[PDB]
């Protein structure tokens, strides 16, 4: 505990935290600039290095954090997150998921974690309804696969297509002009299937929204 106590005083420092939060904003701005073809032609090298750096520093940090916190660290969701997203950046999609390190600014900032925590908190109460929904979708996706998939493969060819189309219908997006009117040119009674779907899923959803009152 001679050396370990010297570490723990660093990790707990506000400097360290202020230093990490710093690099987050830096790297965060860096990634918005890596977005420009122009900028990368002129400064892309300076940048890809500056990235290699921060992920170094961040890896050090986690390892430091893990010494100081031992098994407490892996019981911590905010750290687990921090862990997971740095791990990702160690490893061509993975190239893109590296951006999720900017969420570190949520974990790393208590103002923010509060909100996220506050919203995540409400979720459990909502879940039993979420399974109602999903049971509802699955039954309808199934029925819609076999009612309309033969003549309308793009939208209902497969269970997953039906799931997607039904999601879209639930958002009400182009549901009549784009989906149900076309359908009725072949299945005049398609409205018997989709109007009640909309009544239900967009009456549960309003009700599912309301469970937002916890926050």
């Amino acid at each position: 505990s001679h050396m370990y106590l010297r570490i723990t005083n660093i990790v707990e420092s506000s400097f360290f935290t202020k230093f990490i939060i710093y690099l987050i904003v830096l790297n965060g701005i860096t990634m918005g600039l890596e977005t420009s073809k122009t900028f990368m032609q002129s400064f892309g090298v300076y940048t890809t290095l500056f990235n290699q750096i921060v992920i170094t520093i961040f890896t050090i940090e986690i390892i430091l954090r893990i010494y100081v916190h031992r098994i407490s660290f892996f019981k911590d969701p905010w750290s687990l997150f921090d862990f997971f997203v740095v791990a990702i950046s160690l490893v061509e999609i993975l190239r893109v998921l590296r951006v999720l390190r900017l969420f570190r600014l949520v974990t790393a900032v208590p103002q923010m974690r509060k909100i996220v925590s506050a919203l995540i908190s409400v979720i459990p109460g909502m879940l039993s309804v979420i399974a109602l929904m999903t049971l509802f979708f699955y039954i309808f996706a199934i029925m819609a696969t076999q009612l309309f998939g033969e003549r309308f493969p793009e939208w209902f060819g497969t269970l997953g297509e039906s799931f997607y189309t039904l999601f879209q219908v639930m958002t009400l997006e182009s549901w009549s002009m784009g989906i149900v009117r076309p359908l009725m040119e072949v299945y005049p009674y398609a409205w018997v299937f989709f109007i009640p779907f909309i009544f239900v899923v967009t009456f549960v959803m309003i009700n599912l929204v309301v469970a937002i009152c916890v926050d």
Copy 2:
């Protein structure tokens, strides 16, 4: 009551219930697989039999349930449901409505029945508004049939077309680009009809949503 009491102890068992809930999930997964042309080519037979089985077992169950519960059974909405949906599956749409047996997982699970019951419960308070709405639609569907059906048969040819179009307008889906702008190319004052419709029906509806507070 010698034999009848021996039955009732089976039907009340948690095994029986756990056994029925089981087959529901099984058959439920089965129907998602009956969705695949590939899967049915290779295992469609094993499946259509496995279905014949479960509906047997379920029919037995209801009959058992009916002995144990006598006239209490047909006073029970959850059982009435269970009844109705098994009956359906006994009897080419009926082929498709057989999927409604997966809702048995709502009746059969108390976690779920609570929610459904909880939401169904709110409905009565909402009804008097629902008749307001429907009176509103009917009056407008009528007026819109005779204002626009001649030049716009697809959308307003018939009272039912007008009902459907007005429903669609109520969801705000393509109401301007798809319906009212086209209409105004012939009836420049069509906005006098549809803007107030939207104000009302989408002010009742927000208000109809709010009666969700009971739950």
Copy 3:
């Protein structure tokens, strides 16, 4: 008060009211049938007479009601309504507005008047916001007339076109694909005008909805 008292006992009777409510539903069904070209070919005469009848009966009723109620009658919104809509039906749009007599079923039924009254009641509190809105639209409709009307006459040629388009944008219907993306092909900064419009009008509106709590 010899004769007048004999009348008043009729008008107050539940028979009279039950009799009027009756004809409303009758005529109401009649108008849904006047919707069919087929039905009018076969029974259109029997119908147009049956209409002439009811409006007679209704005119009698109002006149009766007016004797019994004198200046109390014209202080009554439900009767004023009843008055206004029967007057209309006495007098080719007027032909169509005659359908508004089916709203008599709202006045004539207390279950219903309650709701309408209940919703109308909330409106006053909401009004000061409604003038905010309208001031907002007018300022923006003006600014949008003169920013985009020259190159986009259909949508912004006129103040009223701009009012209509902005209403449509407020409902979010096709606002990006149909309006603002097209606009940006000429006015790359059009989003500076429309995103804040949507933020405001669809933050007031949510807030205007909330004043629904009175009911």
Copy 4:
């Protein structure tokens, strides 16, 4: 304080205020008429002068107001506003922003300032969520720039295009028919990116709406 006190009694008068509110409505109506090509051909001169006048009067007013109120004036948001918008009108966009002087009717009317103040008041509580959102957009806009911008430049070519498209997706406008279905013709897994985006941003937003309860 001999002369200064004589002024202050004018500025505090209800006449002055009633006089300024007057010109606002006048000029306000004037600008709706400056909208018509016809009207300007016949009366555009009388009008452009009448405008020069009011902005004179208004400039006088502010200067008066500033004498009476000294450094209190520039600490006042309603006056700062009044200031800013008259300044604008002193100075071809600026030509158009001159319409913002009609908002003077919000400052100048206490009925109105209350509402605005009341709504502005709620904003602070909402802000920490607004930064969550914006952090969310930026991360996704970035990821979407580099996932889809090459094959879909119009919508995702640039970080700002992605910001705009993601805003549009958040409003749910044409998100499936117009954006994500097209995308899936090339990137079959695009739904893995956009469905969760919609779940989050349209679960925060409902929650962000709810903070409306302060008012």
